[model samples]
Target: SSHHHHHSYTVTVATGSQEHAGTDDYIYLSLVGSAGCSEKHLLDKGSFERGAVDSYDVTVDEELGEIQLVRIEKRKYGSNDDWYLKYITLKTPHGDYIEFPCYRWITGDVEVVLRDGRAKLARDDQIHILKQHRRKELETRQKQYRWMEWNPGFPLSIDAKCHKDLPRDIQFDSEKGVDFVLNYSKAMENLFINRFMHMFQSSWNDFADFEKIFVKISNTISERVMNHWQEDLMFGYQFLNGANPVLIRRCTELPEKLPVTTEMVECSLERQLSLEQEVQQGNIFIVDFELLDGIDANKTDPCTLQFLAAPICLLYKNLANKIVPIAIQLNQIPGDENPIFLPSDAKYDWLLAKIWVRSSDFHVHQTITHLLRTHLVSEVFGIAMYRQLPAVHPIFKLLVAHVRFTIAINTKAREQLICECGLFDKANATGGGGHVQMVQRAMKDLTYASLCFPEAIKARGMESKEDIPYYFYRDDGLLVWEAIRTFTAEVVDIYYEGDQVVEEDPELQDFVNDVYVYGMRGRKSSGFPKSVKSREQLSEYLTVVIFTASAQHAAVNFGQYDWASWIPNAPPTMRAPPPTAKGVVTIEQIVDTLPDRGRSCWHLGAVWALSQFQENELFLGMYPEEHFIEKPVKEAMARFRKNLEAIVSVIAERNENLQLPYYYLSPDRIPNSVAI
Candidate 1:
């Protein structure tokens, strides 16, 4: 065996997909001769085993002319276990290497040609290029696989510019919202039937129960959900009749791509609330779930089968885990006792988490769309987008200053938006309620208010009173933007001061940059808004960022603001009206220990609404500046300022630090980028 002195051939190991490559099966290599005799064993045999890369001092008998053939058989005795030539390496004692590649090229003809320098020829210097190529390919795959460390989701690689018709027939029937609900119901029914039919098919009586209550619920889904909204800020679900018998809450496993209503969802929600695993805790899928009693836990088991629930995730929504969460059958009675069918037999008893988010971006958009197309856009254009800008830029540092002052006052109210009661809180913000919830709530007030108003106008009939509709011509777009901007500035100044700013956080810096810089300029986005842009152009984008949110937030929950203001509401629920002021009001508040955003909103609302007055004499109107000195705007600002003063005085009375430097509303003008 020691017949030769010089031996050199670069050795490489390849991972194969030969049967059970990742499991129990294996690989065997042999050095054979032309005479049918071969060394059936190898000292380097263990080289083919798994773990990490294995190294070897592979020596060839220089005397055995070219060592007839290098043979590799994968998992020799296992069924169809022959691996073609799994993973092969080209590195040697010099440490030259590249990740090689995958098996798209696995052919039965796999063989190795040995040469002087680990090549096919005597002086095969060209082999190094393959090493370089392998290294590059490996690097690319590394980046591809490791991207999730920083990027939120997998990178999409489809059409860089794929889109459909735009300014999209925003037009619709007067009954569009209802009509939408009808068409939606049928699709939802098909999904419900196809997806859940098996659950009901188990027994005639079960099917009948399903058909009666659930089928009826599924059929009128749109009607039931729509009927839930209250005239005040509260949505229908908060009311007893609006709430579902059971609402499923799963923060994990949100829908990813296309919308699915009862299309099977593969999740382990039953066992893993994911983040909630500490309390609730698997390749588990989810069916409409209104139908999961169990079927031996096999992937193919009927009960183990997952179906997408009826619009628990829907047809025309942003395939996401956003503000949408539509529920199932409504209670005829408020908070009626939830029935117990063990509740699995009928879909009516359970509300899908998917269903609520399927709730619709502006299911309300349809109503506005219909009104606009049917009666409004014969409505001309309001103000140009740019003019609304070029008006008032903000003093960034002071933005959140006011937000903090008010939040300090309404801290009780704002906390609900983030904490999810106890669903998420400071204790769990890291693990349970991600910053997304806070951002979600912030967007609720800051983003939604501005987003809806402009788009609503671009398409409305006569609008609602509290809504800042159609006044876009007066530049209220900027008014809202500027207001929120001022407030957001305070936010930055408050929470982000020093180390929290950019010192330790990169995400904070990034989103903040997007919000104030690129996003506000319309060049980028407000909140990673590829979703919002799906409906309108970036230039057409306008959002009203609410400063220190809960100002407009409180006194608006459930059915009303009984707890929001300091004064008791009148009568029945002891609901309604302003508190009897022992002393007049100021910067607007029902009067909080922290003051209120009321005076600010009022100042803008007054200026905005007042500016609309064109006057009979074009002289007696709001022209306290151009022709007169004391019109609606002038007096309104002075009064609103007076309101701010009183409130500030009260706040200084409560917590001296909150006292502003004393100026109309203490030194500040009732300024909100107003027009003459």
Candidate 2:
């Protein structure tokens, strides 16, 4: 039925509740519908106060049948005139209500088009004008979110080479960028040991001399590391709860390469069980750094020949629930030259052997676990979502907060941290050329299954609580993962009706295809999907993305200063080669093998800088944007936050009595994104 009747609509606009959300700028609004569009009306008079809801009346000649989109604009007429519009609600004469949620900033002389708050896919838009708006939005986004290859096999990143060069939408805002600079400067002022930087070429006089650098900023964990780093108990404890806790696995049987006999570890084990009995009882665990084998180390003019080792360490769980390293081999191949250093060896010999394994673990943890899995992987999700999903897409809205500022931070990372002659190049053994190759190799081994937390835990055989009892990373990580899964499932249920609806979403399919092709380099071996097939699949993927960006990144990132700032605990590089014979590592040789004073200062500065939280950081479950406006969606988010707070209480109570606390996964401390 073709009908045209004059209709009047009441439009109510609400400004955000954040500080300084009110604006003195001129604001304009327009309503576009199926029949025709309304004229732009400048809502006049003293309105738009912070947390204020102002109503205006507008009438169109034709019956504006279902309101499809709302176009809002702000014209800067005074200083600091930007505005944060919370949402707009339109009440038709026919008693119908429509809400257009816009939890974003409107800068000077810019226009924003917003669809209704209800989540919708591309196929759900039956109106011609709505389809055109979706297409136009993506056309503009695709232009801005262009892909650039960072490395041959590494994940594709934003096209910008530096932070300032990024697009306006992608660049960090003035508040964020200024806050980052201020925070970074404050860290350098407060955390760096100025005396070491002044020394420049001086070396530590002895093992006790390492304590000299801790006068300025030392935490309980770093102090504990300085005191007991050589202890086998703390060595194994770190593999379970340190910065890089992703490596250790419950080993059921000994690897053929590490042939450790029972006699070698008889004194180390709590019980009188043989190695075979320990392996059969699931008391054996191993961390193999085979990825670092045969890799060339960094060589700088100021430093001597740097050495790297790929070590295999065998650990045993004793009756008191403490894990202790039983044996360590410096090389992958088992031979006379690659002697197995046992706890029974000369004291310095065993300690140096454990130190070599820690060095190798550092390379793998930084290049692969911390950077590749969390930062780079989240970047791929961010870019693909921007390019393929329109602003109005439900998936885009659900994911935008988790991925905010990821590309901006990553661009800065490439410029200042990972590039040639950057911080890594100057300090790390795998830095100059080896770090790049390490990422490429790690990418080849990356799998979609590994991104899922439960799948990764199960696949690594790290699920037994009775066996490994105190893996705080796994315990708290599972809690956060499940919370994310529940929240995402509720969001997906609101959007997709069934499996058929998910299969028909072309935009969702394109987003997955972009990630698979560019993120995984179209490697079928990675098992990354070319298309999302079901609602469960989509929900799980979203869980993985959010977890990696927030909780997983926090677990690996925030502990750097606590665990590694004490240099000897986790040296970035070693000067001397691996000892080829047992009992030959003297105390003097041990001091010579550690990183020099300059490199140690470089690493300490880097971690200290990286570990500082920003001034206006948004934590998990804290959406300052207030992006989702639907009643059910907001309620689900509330529940999600409640769950996170509950976990925080549990972690807090557990950390009260521990010598070393694991609080990275406490959602209150975890940022909403990989912003740093």
Candidate 3:
């Protein structure tokens, strides 16, 4: 009996065929299984030929399963070693396992089990990815590059005409013209003198501070004087051009030049000689020609020749002859010392000194004298620039005055001190010494000289009147000797009383102590008043007093006053308000002290009064007229007022504790209640 079997199977060719064939060699076979099939057959392993296929026969029993076969084509492997099948396994129908040996297979039939796989990448795709990366890097580098700025050196253009128009911008017309040029000459002169005085006063230590103050005062004087000149020039120039017809016509029609020659000189000289001869002969003068032929034509510079031919030549000759005598007389006088008149040539010397001192025409004499004195002193001192010290001449005069005053004042004071000290007998006994007699003779000479030359005292004015006597006294030298004796006596008195105290005797000690104490305290006692404790103190005090008095006297002699009532449109005198009245003297009071007729000269008195007070408006009021008229005085007062006002304002604004002691008190309080 025959039975059919059915089974489903998948076959994988694990190995290649061993047959060396070029094309189809073998076929894959599969079998199908049934439920019951049984067959047994003795089969030999068969080798098929290279191009042949063999079929297998099988028998089936009722218990055996059906079997089937499927075929698959086989191709050449080229070599069995060239192909490889690593492993193969199979599963039976009843879950049994089977295994097979690996074998080589054809390259085409060796299929990769592609479980949803992809193809290998191409070279162009890799290049594209690399290019994209490079592009991104380039973009990042470009972002860093940015705009930059820099500067380069170069010249800039400027307008040249800008500065040229500056002068036009300034306004200067007739009404408001610049007058500084006209006044510059005088201003320079005053400035030079002011500076000279400052240098002059600095030589003496005692007067150093005073000289500085004087310099400031003098500077103010010079400034005001210059200001006056400036104003005058401004006004005068305006009047000359705008108001005065004569000046305008002269300015318009004046000739630019005039012809002058030696021929004109020769013609003028010929006529002059004829006129002189006619005048001598008492006949009418006739013009002549060729009379000047043999004249010194070699010296004929046209201007000089013309001057000699002019009629002014006769006047110049006369003037020269007269000046010769005066110059000789001036040369004879002693230039080094005070004016001393010698009996032999007293008239000539005295006349010359007087003429030179008083004559305005002989200003050159003063200038020459100054130059000679500067030269002499500079030679002595070995200074190179003596001309620079203008005050050297004035300083020489001052030195002479100082010596003269010192000798006179000291002499007189010595005589008085000696008489008081009972030194007359001692002086008389010392005949060989003769100091007292010498002092007396010197004093006599000074007194006579002072009396004869009253101008010296008068020049210093009222303040120096009292000093004349003192100066004469010092010339005696007796006063100085007496002062020394008095100083010695006081010292002795103090020593004796000191001895008494050392002894511890109460009665004697009390008396001595009382006397010493009273004497030292400047109280009146049995003998001389003890007010003058020491000679040095007395001398110093007297010197200052005399100096101050002398200066005051000089001021008074030169001072002037005007009648305010006579002045047009001036304010009338009125009663001072209560604030001003306190501790103040009035102008009316000052006027009452003066001579009648409303004219007064009290520069010394005014200066002295002003000096005594920190702020003295009373004296200032008395001299208002003088100040208003005088540029120097007015400027000084203005500066003084400004300085004073600033000081007072500062004090007023200060804290109470910081206020000055004097200002804090009643009578001497800061003048806040009063108006400036």
Candidate 4:
């Protein structure tokens, strides 16, 4: 009885026969519940077919109610300034089955709404309709009611994202687990279909179908590219069909004239696949296949071909690394899920790369754009992190920022955006001091203070309540000290526009020298890029760092601090360390290093690398070595490696204006891309 009492009343619309206006006009009709907009939709393409009447129904308790019937015309945005409505029927059962007062009460120049909100302006002339008399047993209707979500998802950022970290060694044979556990939503579809799929007359519906064409093209060129790791080169196989000629390669020995020997053929053919072919292992491969639309897929092999690329990470692997492919595998669309296996010592990955980047058979082009954007994507449309215990939240938060930071920096627009946003910073305003002086002095102090982390935290050098995590933690990091009492003196760049200040920190100058100069071998090496020395140059570098690394490490290492977020860009605070603290060279020393004179590297270069002097460094010099002789250092190094690589790539990606459209076509005209 309770179940039947819950919704004792029945409401039904026998048919909607209204008509007019094609495509642009959409009519909405729904049964409104007492709670109003909260109720789910009952039914539409707006106009019902002439032969079929729209029939809809809802069951509810009608003790004190009026059945409100509605009809509305949904119009296009920006173009439709006017609206119209057809009818409104508000009545009830047991009281007296009834309908709308089409003659007058429907009101003109007036718009009515539903709980969830529907706009249908009252129309003229359609008011002469009214219904009643014995309902139910008298008849039945066929146009059934269809129900769906109260609201479909908003296409663009009206959505959100989530992520997780997994064991590097974890293995999975099936792609299903990877679909959710490792990757987020399909990037391309979310951006377009969510934003404006209807905008295009024709677009990709399935990424798989899109990838098949490229796969078939690339497959035809597979043999030629597979021959040589002689170079990490991209070559094109052009086809001028119908006028076929015997293709020949200049040979030292005649083919038929010299009686082609079996052993000789084996040596040439097996060179790449054989264990003896070690010469090409170091090489990378990329080949572009071109067709005049003549080669038939059936003529070659339907077995050949596969994939579309949209992920940033995979994009980097394809174009950045130089290697020749061993074979082309069209396994991206997952017509059949299979494991890719190779010999333990197999050399090149060009074959596997094709498989990794495959996408859904929908929206291939946008997916590629998404892939390109992410690899060098800009802007943090929004930022998010998962909820966790206070103790672990900081690490989680930084992991979140890292996503935003890494993607933003790689967009090839970081340097430009920072300047446009006016994010110039001040020197040592956070205690960093002059540009060249701090690096010179810090290295000097780092030489002495590094052994004891700048003479601070002398009691056992380092302290932490926890054991380990992610090497980005200062103590576990390869860049810090044995027992480092490192206090991050970030000069701090602005997060958004309008917060520019001139920060002249020598540590940054010295820092760039180590990363860009020494480690990268700037001055002496032909390929090395020179360091960004001046405050103006430093401004861009820090802007990049703050958005990426500082943001990442702050959060990853945030567990050590009481706060759940790492505010790396926030103003530096005073350190009330006791006199007993055995600290490295302080900003006081670097200021002294500034001397009572001069400028340029002459003033700064003299004391450089003095930070190298310490075995137990307190703070960083131009470069600080973690110098930790501890267990599991390798594990932490791998995680940290991913971190530093991001820093390395962010700086490198900017020098090239690589628009993603540069693929699929001959790359000969494309500018040479940089290699790591």
Return the top candidate by lDDT: 2
Candidate 3: Cα lDDT at 100: 30
Put down candidate 4 lDDT per residue, 1-676, tens digits, no spaces.
0011112333332221222112223334444433342233333434333223233444433333333334333434334422212123333445544443221111122323321112111221132221111111012100111111111211111111111111111111121322211121232132122233122122223333223322332222222332321232221111000000001111222212122223332322333442123223322112221110111111111121211221111000122332222332222221122222111112223212222211111111111112111122111111111111010111221222223223222222122211222111110111111212222222222211122221222222222223211112222222222211111112111111122222222222333443333222232422222443343343343333322233212222111111100111011111111111122324342222221111111111111111011232111121111221122432343444344444334334532443211111111111111000
Error of 4 at 489 (Å): 7.3
Q: Which regions of candidate 1 are displaced past 4 Å? A: 1-431, 434-523, 527-552, 555-634, 638-676
Better of 2 and 3 by lDDT: 2
What TM-score goes with each of the models? 0.21, 0.90, 0.13, 0.18
For TM-score, candidate 1 versus 4, the one ahead is: 1
Model 4 poorest 10 in a row by lDDT: 239-248
The runs of at least 3 residues in candidate 3 whose Cα sits more than 4 Å from the true structure, single-residue gaps closed, are 1-328, 333-353, 359-543, 546-676
| TM-score, predicted candidate 1 vs. hidden true structure | 0.21
- Least accurate stretch of 10 residues (summed lDDT) in model 3? 307-316
Cα lDDT listed for each candidate: 0.24, 0.83, 0.22, 0.22
* Candidate that beats the other on lDDT, 1 or 4, i.e. the better one: 1
Q: Candidate 3 lDDT, tens digit per residue, 41-153?
A: 22213223332323333333343232211112233434332222222333443443333322222233432111001111112123433334223423432232111111011
Report lDDT (Cα) of residue 520, candidate 1. 28
Report how far off residue 269 is in candidate 2 (Å): 3.2
